[PDB]
Every structure is written in structure tokens, then in C-alpha cells.
Scaffold this motif. Structure first.
Motif, PDB file in Angstrom:
ATOM      1  N   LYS A   1      42.311  31.032  49.829  1.00  0.00           N
ATOM      2  CA  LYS A   1      43.556  30.275  49.938  1.00  0.00           C
ATOM      3  C   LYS A   1      44.315  30.161  48.617  1.00  0.00           C
ATOM      4  O   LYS A   1      45.535  29.957  48.633  1.00  0.00           O
ATOM      5  CB  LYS A   1      43.275  28.873  50.493  1.00  0.00           C
ATOM      6  CG  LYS A   1      42.488  27.977  49.562  1.00  0.00           C
ATOM      7  CD  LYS A   1      41.661  26.970  50.350  1.00  0.00           C
ATOM      8  CE  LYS A   1      40.944  25.999  49.425  1.00  0.00           C
ATOM      9  NZ  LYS A   1      41.914  25.177  48.660  1.00  0.00           N
TER      10      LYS A   1
ATOM     11  N   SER B   1      46.620  37.812  54.731  1.00  0.00           N
ATOM     12  CA  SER B   1      47.087  36.424  54.630  1.00  0.00           C
ATOM     13  C   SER B   1      46.372  35.490  55.613  1.00  0.00           C
ATOM     14  O   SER B   1      46.223  34.294  55.330  1.00  0.00           O
ATOM     15  CB  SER B   1      48.606  36.358  54.838  1.00  0.00           C
ATOM     16  OG  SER B   1      48.984  36.773  56.141  1.00  0.00           O
TER      17      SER B   1
ATOM     18  N   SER C   1      46.981  33.507  46.782  1.00  0.00           N
ATOM     19  CA  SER C   1      48.270  33.762  47.420  1.00  0.00           C
ATOM     20  C   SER C   1      49.364  33.892  46.374  1.00  0.00           C
ATOM     21  O   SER C   1      50.417  33.259  46.467  1.00  0.00           O
ATOM     22  CB  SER C   1      48.600  32.653  48.420  1.00  0.00           C
ATOM     23  OG  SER C   1      48.478  33.082  49.768  1.00  0.00           O
TER      24      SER C   1
ATOM     25  N   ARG D   1      43.466  34.098  53.888  1.00  0.00           N
ATOM     26  CA  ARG D   1      43.945  33.142  52.888  1.00  0.00           C
ATOM     27  C   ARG D   1      44.491  31.848  53.490  1.00  0.00           C
ATOM     28  O   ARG D   1      44.998  31.001  52.741  1.00  0.00           O
ATOM     29  CB  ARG D   1      45.021  33.788  52.004  1.00  0.00           C
ATOM     30  CG  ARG D   1      44.546  35.099  51.378  1.00  0.00           C
ATOM     31  CD  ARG D   1      45.410  35.542  50.214  1.00  0.00           C
ATOM     32  NE  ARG D   1      46.836  35.555  50.511  1.00  0.00           N
ATOM     33  CZ  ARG D   1      47.498  36.604  50.998  1.00  0.00           C
ATOM     34  NH1 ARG D   1      46.874  37.752  51.256  1.00  0.00           N
ATOM     35  NH2 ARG D   1      48.800  36.510  51.217  1.00  0.00           N
TER      36      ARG D   1
ATOM     37  N   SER E   1      46.129  38.363  47.799  1.00  0.00           N
ATOM     38  CA  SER E   1      47.325  39.153  48.080  1.00  0.00           C
ATOM     39  C   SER E   1      47.478  40.471  47.296  1.00  0.00           C
ATOM     40  O   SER E   1      46.689  40.788  46.409  1.00  0.00           O
ATOM     41  CB  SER E   1      48.582  38.306  47.818  1.00  0.00           C
ATOM     42  OG  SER E   1      48.752  38.054  46.421  1.00  0.00           O
TER      43      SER E   1
ATOM     44  N   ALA F   1      46.985  31.295  55.836  1.00  0.00           N
ATOM     45  CA  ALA F   1      48.405  31.142  56.123  1.00  0.00           C
ATOM     46  C   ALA F   1      48.638  30.660  57.556  1.00  0.00           C
ATOM     47  O   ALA F   1      47.931  31.054  58.491  1.00  0.00           O
ATOM     48  CB  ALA F   1      49.141  32.457  55.881  1.00  0.00           C
TER      49      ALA F   1
ATOM     50  N   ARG G   1      57.355  37.140  62.317  1.00  0.00           N
ATOM     51  CA  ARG G   1      56.067  36.667  61.822  1.00  0.00           C
ATOM     52  C   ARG G   1      55.121  36.361  62.982  1.00  0.00           C
ATOM     53  O   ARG G   1      55.532  36.221  64.132  1.00  0.00           O
ATOM     54  CB  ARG G   1      56.237  35.407  60.984  1.00  0.00           C
ATOM     55  CG  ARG G   1      57.474  35.386  60.095  1.00  0.00           C
ATOM     56  CD  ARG G   1      57.119  35.774  58.688  1.00  0.00           C
ATOM     57  NE  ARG G   1      55.940  35.064  58.197  1.00  0.00           N
ATOM     58  CZ  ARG G   1      55.177  35.522  57.207  1.00  0.00           C
ATOM     59  NH1 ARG G   1      55.489  36.667  56.617  1.00  0.00           N
ATOM     60  NH2 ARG G   1      54.110  34.845  56.810  1.00  0.00           N
TER      61      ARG G   1
ATOM     62  N   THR H   1      41.617  41.088  51.369  1.00  0.00           N
ATOM     63  CA  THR H   1      42.139  39.724  51.436  1.00  0.00           C
ATOM     64  C   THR H   1      43.371  39.537  50.560  1.00  0.00           C
ATOM     65  O   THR H   1      44.274  38.777  50.930  1.00  0.00           O
ATOM     66  CB  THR H   1      41.043  38.737  51.065  1.00  0.00           C
ATOM     67  OG1 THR H   1      39.976  38.892  52.000  1.00  0.00           O
ATOM     68  CG2 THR H   1      41.532  37.294  51.129  1.00  0.00           C
TER      69      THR H   1
ATOM     70  N   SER I   1      51.401  35.035  59.531  1.00  0.00           N
ATOM     71  CA  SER I   1      51.058  36.299  58.886  1.00  0.00           C
ATOM     72  C   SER I   1      52.074  37.384  59.221  1.00  0.00           C
ATOM     73  O   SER I   1      52.633  37.407  60.319  1.00  0.00           O
ATOM     74  CB  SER I   1      49.667  36.778  59.321  1.00  0.00           C
ATOM     75  OG  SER I   1      48.669  35.904  58.810  1.00  0.00           O
TER      76      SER I   1
END
Ligand SMILES: Nc1nc(C[C@H]2C[C@H](O)[C@@H](COP(=O)(O)OP(=O)(O)OP(=O)(O)O)O2)c(NC=O)c(=O)[nH]1
Ligand SMILES: [Ca+2]
Ligand SMILES: [Ca+2]
Ligand SMILES: [Ca+2]
Ligand SMILES: [Cl-]
Ligand SMILES: [Cl-]
Ligand SMILES: [Cl-]
Ligand code: NA
Ligand code: NA
Ligand code: NA
Ligand code: NA
Length: 326
Positions: A322, A171, A325, A174, A266, A176, A140, A264, A179
Motif C-alpha cells: 500500500k 494496484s 504507490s 497495493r 507501482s 486501491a 476504471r 505489484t 484499478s
DNA sequence: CCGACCGCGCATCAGC
DNA sequence: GCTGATGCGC
DNA sequence: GTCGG
């Protein structure tokens, strides 16, 4: 998380149907069920309680009952034990090796990482790079590193042409804290739905990022989509950063909001939103939202000035990145 | 019961 | 070469 | 595998 054991189980089942069964609708059915259970704000106590959710049906309810009583799923326990399923699930973790290629490799006796590394000549270009960075691509990316990557991309694109706008989506957008990879949406005023007044708009940006050693490899590349590999620079006497996957999508500038909505995500959110669009009589892609006529033929594109305009058309209250997701 | 399942860019290949 | 299907990916 | 009609 509240129902982590159930959502892992359904995800593993989804991956089985995709990679091994090659059953794309069952893959999506399990993915939807895991998404709805992941946002459910109670610790689930029974399969009947779960079956109340949309996309959780009778078969998954039963599996949930088994999992709650025993901690496991016999159907998955046997899938794990099966050598052909296990081999196929492993090979598909290489970028560029899909369900069809994985099974063909297993037929030829190629089924371990060692096997792959002895047989580069049997791989196409994409698969060879995916093998090259197999370990890196499964790590990640901390948001801190995503921020340095953002700064490089935006500043280098600025140097090519101050009229480019590059937006990091996926992500990262959003919110995270980590990512899977970097997704960059690119616009330039010379590329609209109406005209392409300059060629090589994507190439020039890729070239600049290669020149500064940020982009390191190319999986695929056309006029509007780049799929490749990038890497942050490191300091003196420090280990190098892992190599990372990067996607760049050039979108017509007048279609930015549809593009940034798509990019964007998901992915499950997009599918859910597009599935809901069709129920309301619309079709959404990364360029436009269009009405469906009486025959089912897409009409002309509806006016969009915001991401919210798209939710409005399909009678959804706007959701900030956000909360997309799913 | 059964049709329908989100939408598309790039790479690869068979048929012509 | 071109087009359409398929594979794989986002 | 699940759903709407
Ligand atoms: N319509 C649609 N879109 C996508 C991909 C979109 C949405 C996703 O947020 C974005 C980038 O894909 P990516 O695999 O990088 O996902 P991301 O959400 O960033 O997660 P991650 O990188 O793993 O942290 O492109 C799909 N991909 C997967 O679901 C899909 O199935 N349908
Ligand atoms: Ca991503
Ligand atoms: Ca990506
Ligand atoms: Ca490495
Ligand atoms: Cl299926
Ligand atoms: Cl738009
Ligand atoms: Cl369109
Ligand atoms: Na249900
Ligand atoms: Na793969
Ligand atoms: Na080797
Ligand atoms: Na290096």
C-alpha cells in the motif's frame, strides 16, 4: 489532493514528451517530479520550495512558479492548441498505437476515432482490439468488481491444476479502491529456474479461462506472458459489464518474490527502486537481484526468501504494498 | 560540464 | 528460417 | 529534464 494542479501539469508534460517528442528520458523526468510532489505533505507555495525535492530541477521550478501565479502553463496551452500534437496524443490512447504509429497514422490522414473505425484494415491485431474496446479500456475497475474477477480466476486455475498459485498484483495488491486493469502472477511447481518439466502451463490456464467466457480476446501470447481482454458475467436483464484488460505472467516458482515485487509496482516505484539498486551496486529484475562486479557485469543471483529480502539488500526499510504507490 | 537514465516479454521487420 | 533492432506494452 | 561525480 494537496498539489493536484501541479502534478496534473507535470503528468501532461510527461505525456507530451513521450507521445509527441518521443523523448523517453524527459517523459521519465517529468514522471519522477510528479511522483515526488504527489507525496509531499504540504501545499506547495513556490517553485523554490519545490526545487528542494529530488528530481525537481530549475526548469520545473520555473514552470511551478508560473502555475502558482496564473493557474496555467503557457507552454501547455500552446501544446493543447496544436492540431498535430493533439491528434498524436489522442491516437496513442488506443492500445497498440504508440508514438511512432500515431505519427504515421496522422501522416496518412487517419486522426479521429471515426477515421480509425473506417480503416480497420490498416490496423494490426492488437490495435484492432484496442479500438474495439476503446471506451471500455478507459473506464476504471471498482475494487468490488476486482474481487469478483479474482474469485473467478483463482477458482478456474484451481480446476486446471490444484498446484497452480495465481496472485492478483498491480494496484489491486497495493489496496486501491479502483484499478486500471487486472494483473495475475502465476506459478506452477513444474516451471522453475532449473527446468520446465511441463509444456503449455500458461496456455492451459488461458484455455480454461476462454472456455468459461471470462477471457474474450488475446492481444499477445507467448510461453510466459499473456496480454488480453476479460469480462465479468452479468445477471438476467442487466447491462453487461465493461470489457477489461488482463495481463498474466508465468514466473518460475523459485523466483516468486522477485516476480511479485515487480508485478505489484507501482511502475514509478519499480524504476525508483531499480535506479536506487544500481547506486547500491545491484541490478533487480522480475527474476533475480544480482551484484554488479567491478566491471559492471551482473554477478550470480543472490538468495531471496521474501519481498523484504530485496529491500534489505539495497538498504531500504520494507514498505508494504500500500505504500509503494509512488 | 556530461554521462547515465529500470528492465524485459511479445510482435514486426530488415538483412542474410 | 535465424538474429538483432525497434515498437509497444507490463 | 535532472542528477552525481
Ligand atoms: N519496471 C517497470 N514495471 C512496470 C510495470 C509493473 C509495475 C506495475 O505495478 C505492474 C502492472 O502494470 P500496470 O500498468 O497494470 O499498473 P498498476 O500499477 O496495476 O496500475 P493501474 O492498473 O493503472 O491501476 O507491472 C512499468 N510500467 C510502468 O511504469 C515500468 O515502467 N517499469
Ligand atoms: Ca493493473
Ligand atoms: Ca496491467
Ligand atoms: Ca462495452
Ligand atoms: Cl529524452
Ligand atoms: Cl525471488
Ligand atoms: Cl536474471
Ligand atoms: Na531538486
Ligand atoms: Na497506445
Ligand atoms: Na467500420
Ligand atoms: Na456479450
Amino acid at each position: 489532493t494537496l498539489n493536484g494542479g501541479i502534478t496534473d501539469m507535470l503528468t501532461e508534460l510527461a505525456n507530451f514528451e513521450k507521445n509527441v517528442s518521443q523523448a523517453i528520458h524527459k517523459y521519465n523526468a517529468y514522471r519522477k517530479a510528479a511522483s515526488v510532489i504527489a507525496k509531499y505533505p504540504h501545499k506547495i507555495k513556490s517553485g523554490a520550495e519545490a526545487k528542494k525535492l529530488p528530481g525537481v530541477g530549475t526548469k520545473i521550478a520555473e514552470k511551478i512558479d508560473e502555475f502558482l501565479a496564473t493557474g496555467k502553463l503557457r507552454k501547455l496551452e500552446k501544446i493543447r492548441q496544436d492540431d498535430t500534437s493533439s491528434s498524436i496524443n489522442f491516437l496513442t490512447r488506443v492500445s497498440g498505437i504508440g508514438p511512432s504509429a500515431a505519427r504515421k497514422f496522422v501522416d496518412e490522414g487517419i486522426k479521429t476515432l471515426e477515421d480509425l473505425r473506417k480503416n480497420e484494415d490498416k490496423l494490426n491485431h492488437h490495435q484492432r482490439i484496442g479500438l474495439k474496446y476503446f471506451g471500455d479500456f478507459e473506464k476504471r475497475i471498482p475494487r468490488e468488481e476486482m474481487l469478483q474477477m479474482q474469485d473467478i480466476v483463482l477458482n478456474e486455475v484451481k480446476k486446471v491444476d490444484s498446484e497452480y498459485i495465481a496472485t492478483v498484483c498491480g494496484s489491486f495488491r497495493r489496496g486501491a479502491e479502483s484499478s486500471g486493469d487486472m494483473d495475475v502472477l502465476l506459478t506452477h511447481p513444474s516451471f522453475t529456474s532449473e527446468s520446465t518439466k511441463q509444456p503449455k502451463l500458461l496456455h492451459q490456464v488461458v484455455e480454461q479461462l476462454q472456455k468459461v467466457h471470462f477471457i474474450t480476446d488475446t492481444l499477445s501470447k507467448g510461453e510466459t506472458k499473456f496480454m488480453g481482454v476479460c469480462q465479468l458475467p452479468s445477471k438476467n436483464d442487466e447491462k453487461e459489464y465493461p470489457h477489461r484488460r488482463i495481463d498474466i505472467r508465468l514466473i518460475p516458482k523459485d523466483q516468486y518474490y522477485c516476480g511479485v515485487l515487480y508485478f505489484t509496482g507501482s511502475g514509478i516505484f519499480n524504476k525508483n527502486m531499480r535506479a536506487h539498486a544500481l547506486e547500491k551496486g545491484f541490478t533487480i529484475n522480475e527474476y533475480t537481484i544480482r551484484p554488479l562486479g567491478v566491471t559492471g557485469v551482473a554477478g550470480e543471483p543472490l538468495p531471496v526468501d521474501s519481498e523484504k529480502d530485496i529491500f534489505d539488500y539495497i538498504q531500504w526499510k520494507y514498505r508494504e504494498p500500500k505504500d509503494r504507490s509512488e
